[PDB]
Design a binder for these strands. Structure first.
Lengths: 88, 66, 97, 131, 68, 163
RNA sequence: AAACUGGGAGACUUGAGUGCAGAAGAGGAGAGUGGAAUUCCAUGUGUAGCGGUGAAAUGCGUAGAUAUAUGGAGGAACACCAGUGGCGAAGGCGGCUCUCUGGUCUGUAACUGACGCUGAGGCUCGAAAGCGUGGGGAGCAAACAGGAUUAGAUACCCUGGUAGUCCACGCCGUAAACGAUGAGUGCUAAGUGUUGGAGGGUUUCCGCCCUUCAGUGCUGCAGCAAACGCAUUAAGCACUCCGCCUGGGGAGUACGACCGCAAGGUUGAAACUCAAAGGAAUUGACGGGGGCCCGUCAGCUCGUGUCGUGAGAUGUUGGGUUAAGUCCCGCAACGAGCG
């Protein structure tokens, strides 16, 4: 839902080298922006059951990528989840 | 039978050029099928939206007997 | 960027030629006060209609050309004021591309 | 998703054999190359050529047919499966079709035929029967 | 089933039952009635006698008794 | 190919069947016969025919039975290896046996097996027991028997290299 | 001992995702708006019927009906377009404009580097009917009233008519919820339609030929099936994971337990009783099924072949002609007997 300038704005600060659109940092940060905006839209339109499906699938994708990042490098994982403000 | 919207290379329909629209409606005002006019699948969707737009803005009759 | 619209309304036929200019300028203003960059405003033609709307079988068509960001509360203001007037009969706002 | 590449190889061979045409290609692997050599040594395949560009593969097999276009391999079966593995002891090595067919066994000293294993007296994982 | 389904929940067969069930009995003397003691016969006292008519399509008056 | 019917052949009845067809009024009845045919040396055929009486039926069946015949290889009174023959709901397993053990086989399959000169073999029917389909499945399973010579010829090997 | 499965340190790009450039759509939520028709109301003209059925009657009408002309009020559904078309995980989604929003497809080759698949228990959604609170209510219509029909008619038919069908918010959680066909992945002849893209040629090709992705239909081979049939959209050949079955009744019943305002839903036996119950196809007989013909009818079977796993079929079906199974032509049939 975020514009195409917000997206590049936030993938230019979780990159690692240049040209770095992959790298699970980028993907979970952009997914976090999406999930926040969709939560807003749901609070407003709470009987849009057909958009809630997409919300839930984004949440599944993010949790999966987090599991991957943890199982391979705990330092990057901790530093991220501090920087991004989650892990309740 | 050639798609007259493909005769010219016409990009937009504009629902205002009631001269072009008026050849897809019968002698009573009803929309003619994609067969009797030989147009394509998507140009037909655009044409239908065009004349439905026209009828509302009073450029074109819904029914025409009186 | 922005989005482009085309507003098209139908004025009453039997008005004079100064209330008409007053109306046109009025709605240009009240479009612009909400951040709607108007970029064209014309008369079109005098036509008869295919059915009578209120009691009228003629009317004067006027079209405007306007861009704005998609969230500005401008183009709804036109609606809300136009459906309570006495000289306009119909309007159609339409995204243009 | 693919979970058994050895079974996929075997079913390519059987599928292209039953329709009776004379070539076949697979993505390569160290185990499939082994059993392609074992299939070539006994007389089921005619040849095998190894191309390789930028991913694993590939391996090309050339089937073989009789004098009246009848088939030299008649069927082919995967024994050990991911989900139920089959290990055999040196005195349990099987004899498929009373010696007229072969079994393929992986041992501590190669991927070998079932004759070569009951001549060495060892056992291991059982890959396939081809009769 | 897959063999994982089988390992999660095994196979169970059907249970057979006699057609002479009143011949696995137990006393009613001290406490209660015990079921281990399969007999080939049992004895009793006949509380009535008489006759009855068979099913379809036989026809007779077949002699019987009721026994405790 | 055609093993041509020019030998010394001992037939055998395997089944008969009273079969009707209801017509206007009452009922018609024929007799269907199932027969096997062989010489107890390795050539066996089956065939069936129907007529209005039992002798005429069995005759037409032997007529039919002789038109087909199979080769049935063996290696010293015992089948070369193990086969499973399937034809429409009849499944029959056959194994090589021990010298002087006999034939342990059911009704229909033992007729087929004995009239080809088989002496020592074990069988089992994991299927239906309708005589026609049992006979057809049994013959379907003999056709899979492979000689030891042919295998060595098809591959690039010799015998005593694969046995 | 070190091939395979597991563990540890690495490396790779094909699976999976991301970036960049594009495409289609009754996908969903909110807010306004348009015309056609039905009902009621108001007014003018207007004379005796209207309405309804297989026939009638009940009903409305000389307090001026029906018809006809002009004006208002309200509600619900969206003609043509419209299509074995499109979209959605399913239930489902069709007038028009704007706002907010989910997914799919195609090309490319910046990037990450196996991040994947399936999923008991758990959550979310789920036609119609039904339940609660407060609105709305034109047409249709359970229950109900009146008229008919019949031996009777607590039905079918006619005149009326309440809940409900509609909106907001809660509850319910079931359907022949069906393709009676769980999801992922690879492999195996061809021919022909249509929806959305991408490349090459001839080039007004933007209308034509060829190739290639993803949907959606028809025909058909190997193979499969008990037959029906299925067949690159498998019911074929194979691997992974889940759900479920084990003769018919008793019975989705009883008991216990969880859920629900209720109605009920989910879970789920045994005692006893029968020797069958089923699927698919075959020949007859029947139908308040259909078509052709005609005005002593023209039919009933066999032998050798071929077809079918089998009962069986073919012949004896088809065109024409004839009073005629009477003749000709064609055809896995060729001949024969009584008519």
């Amino acid at each position: 839902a975020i514009s195409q300038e917000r997206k590049n704005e936030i993938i230019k600060e979780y990159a690692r080298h240049e040209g770095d659109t992959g790298s699970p940092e980028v993907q979970i940060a952009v997914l976090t922006e999406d999930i926040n905006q969709l939560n807003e839209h749901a609070r407003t339109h709470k009987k849009d059951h057909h958009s809630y499906r997409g919300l839930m699938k984004k949440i599944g994708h993010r949790r999966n990528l987090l599991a991957y990042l943890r199982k391979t490098d705990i330092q990057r994982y901790r530093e991220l989840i501090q920087r991004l403000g989650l892990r309740r | 039978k050639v798609d007259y919207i493909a005769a010219n290379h016409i990009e937009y329909i504009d629902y205002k050029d009631t001269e072009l629209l008026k050849r897809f409606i019968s002698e009573r005002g009803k929309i003619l099928p994609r067969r009797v006019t030989g147009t394509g699948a998507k140009n037909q969707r655009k044409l239908t939206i065009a004349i439905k737009r026209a009828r509302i803005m009073g450029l074109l009759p819904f029914v025409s007997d009186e | 960027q922005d989005t482009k619209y085309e507003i098209m309304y139908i004025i009453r036929p039997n008005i004079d030629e100064e209330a008409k200019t007053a109306l046109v300028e009025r709605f240009d203003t009240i479009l612009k006060d909400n951040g709607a960059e108007v970029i064209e405003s014309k008369d079109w033609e005098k036509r008869r209609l295919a059915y009578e709307m209120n009691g009228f079988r003629e009317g004067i068509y006027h079209i405007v050309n306007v861009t704005s960001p998609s969230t500005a509360g401008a183009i709804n203001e036109f609606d809300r004021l136009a459906k309570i007037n006495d000289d306009i009969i119909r309007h159609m706002i339409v995204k243009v591309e | 998703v693919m979970t058994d590449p050895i079974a996929d190889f075997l079913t390519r061979i059987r599928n292209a054999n039953m329709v009776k045409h004379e070539t076949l290609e697979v993505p390569a692997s160290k185990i499939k190359r082994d059993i392609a050599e074992i299939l070539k040594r006994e007389g089921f395949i005619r040849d095998v050529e190894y191309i390789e560009d930028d991913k694993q593969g590939v391996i090309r097999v050339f089937l073989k047919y009789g004098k009246n276009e009848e088939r030299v391999i008649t069927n082919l079966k995967r024994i050990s499966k991911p989900g139920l593995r089959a290990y055999v002891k040196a005195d349990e090595v099987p004899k498929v079709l009373n010696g007229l067919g072969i079994a393929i066994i992986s041992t501590s000293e190669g991927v070998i035929t079932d004759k070569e294993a009951r001549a060495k007296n060892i056992g291991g994982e059982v890959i396939a029967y081809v009769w | 089933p897959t063999i994982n389904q089988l390992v999660r929940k095994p196979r169970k067969s059907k249970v057979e039952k006699s057609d002479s069930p009143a011949l696995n009995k137990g006393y009613n003397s001290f406490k209660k009635t015990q079921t281990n003691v399969n007999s080939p016969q049992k004895r009793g006292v006949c509380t009535r006698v008489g006759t009855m008519t068979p099913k379809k399509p036989n026809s007779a008056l077949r002699k019987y008794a009721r026994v405790r | 190919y055609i093993d041509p019917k020019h030998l010394e052949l001992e037939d055998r009845v395997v089944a008969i069947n009273r079969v009707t067809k209801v017509v206007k009024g009452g009922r018609r009845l024929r007799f269907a016969a199932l027969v096997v045919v062989g010489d107890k040396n390795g050539h066996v055929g089956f065939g069936t025919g129907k007529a209005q009486e039992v002798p005429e039926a069995i005759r037409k069946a032997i007529e039919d039975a002789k038109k087909n015949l199979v080769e049935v290889p063996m290696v010293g009174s015992t089948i070369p290896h193990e086969v499973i023959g399937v034809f429409g709901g009849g499944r029959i397993l056959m194994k090589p046996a021990v010298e002087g053990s006999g034939v342990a086989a059911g009704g229909p399959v033992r007729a087929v097996l004995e009239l080809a000169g088989v002496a020592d073999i074990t069988s089992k029917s994991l299927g239906s027991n309708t005589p026609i389909n049992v006979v057809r499945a049994t013959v379907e399973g003999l056709k899979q028997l492979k000689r030891a010579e042919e295998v060595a010829a098809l591959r690039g090997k010799s015998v005593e290299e694969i046995i």
